[PDB]
Amino acid sequence: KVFGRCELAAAMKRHGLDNYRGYSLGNWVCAAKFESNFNTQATNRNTDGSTDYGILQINSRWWCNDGRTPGSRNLCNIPCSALLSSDITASVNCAKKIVSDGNGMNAWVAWRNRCKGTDVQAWIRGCRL
Numbered sequence: 001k002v003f004g005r006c007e008l009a010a011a012m013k014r015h016g017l018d019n020y021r022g023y024s025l026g027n028w029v030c031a032a033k034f035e036s037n038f039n040t041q042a043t044n045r046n047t048d049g050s051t052d053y054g055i056l057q058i059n060s061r062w063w064c065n066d067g068r069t070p071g072s073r074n075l076c077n078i079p080c081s082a083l084l085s086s087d088i089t090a091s092v093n094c095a096k097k098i099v100s101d102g103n104g105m106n107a108w109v110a111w112r113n114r115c116k117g118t119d120v121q122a123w124i125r126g127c128r129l
C-alpha cells in the first residue's frame, strides 16, 4: 500500500508514535517519506547482504528474519515479510524498539540526512489529527 501523507500521520498517531521518545509526529512522517516514499512494500538490498523492509526500511541484520542474512539477530522477533503489510502495526512496534536502542532516530540514515534539523512540522500541516 502507498500511503497518503496525512493518512500515514493519522495511522502513526493512533499507534502511539507522536512524541514517542521525544520525536514529534513530523519526524516519523518525514522518515517514512524519504525511506520508502510511503510504500509499505519497499525493499532495498545492502552491500553486506542484508535487506531493508517496509515503510521505515527496517534492516534484516538486526531486527527481522528474512532467512538469507547469515548471523542476523531478529530483535523484533518477526519475519521481515510482516513489515511489508498494509497494516503498519508490525513496523511501528519494531521501530519503537529501534528508536529506544541508543542513537534514537539517527538509526535511519534518511532521517539523519534529510529530516534532522529541518522544519519537520511541515509534514503534518493541513492534516486532521
Ligand SMILES: [Cl-]
Residues within 6 Å of the ligand: 021, 103, 104, 105
Ligand atoms: Cl533521542
Ligand code: NA
Residues within 6 Å of the ligand: 060, 061, 062, 063, 064, 065, 066, 069, 072, 073, 074, 075
Ligand atoms: Na535477522
